[PDB]
Paper text:
Protein lysine methyltransferases (PKMTs) comprise a subfamily of posttranslational modifying enzymes that transfer a methyl group from the cofactor S-adenosyl-L-methionine (SAM). Disruption of endogenous SETD8 leads to cell cycle arrest and chromatin decondensation, consistent with essential roles for SETD8 in transcriptional regulation and DNA damage response. Here we solved four distinct crystal structures of SETD8 in alternative ligand-binding states with covalent SETD8 inhibitors and native ligands.
Furthermore, the post-SET motif of APO structurally resembles an intermediate state between BC-Inh1 and BC-Inh2 but is distinct from those of BC-SAM and TC. In contrast to the structurally diverse SET-I (I1-3) and post-SET motifs (P1-4) in these structures, their pre-SET motifs show only slightly altered configuration. Interconversions between metastable conformers cover a broad spatio-temporal scale in particular associated with motions of SETD8’s SET-I and post-SET motifs. In the apo landscape, the general structural features of the X-ray structures of BC-Inh1, BC-Inh2, APO, BC-SAM and TC are recapitulated by a subset of macrostates (e.g. A6 for BC-Inh1; A10 for BC-Inh2; A12 for APO; A20 for BC-SAM; A22, A24 for TC, 6 of 24 macrostates, Figure 11).
Author numbering: 189 to 267, 269 to 350
The structure:
Amino acid sequence: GSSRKSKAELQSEERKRIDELIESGKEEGMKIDLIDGKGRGVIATKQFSRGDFVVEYHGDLIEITDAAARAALYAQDPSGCYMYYFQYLSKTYCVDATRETNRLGRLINHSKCGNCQTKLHDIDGVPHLILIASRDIAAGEELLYDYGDRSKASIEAHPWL
């Protein structure tokens, strides 16, 4: 197999890698830390390249089916027990991350000026919410993403608006 691996082949391999990490729940390259002037967050312990899978946002998947419940989701503010939500294949889902686990995605802080972005990842039709590096990230940096990145698109599509 000496032929140069395609950009497509690499993405296919990374999809397979991600499926397995999501299956295993193995998490490498991050730790909880205490940050001076902020408190608890999650930091990189190794380098991440722009576009690298960072962590799954792991918790309990809940499907939401009525307009009122959707409004309740959409009207949320990033600041506690914020329930991250998304649209997938004409369904609405949120992830309840309130159970205490060892899975670290739930502990990554919110920022409008972050270094990670969310992405949906399909495993046999089941959407998984993962975090991806928006740029090169150094060991030692706090991981941050925008909790509100999907709100505007969700709100605009709501039947009551």
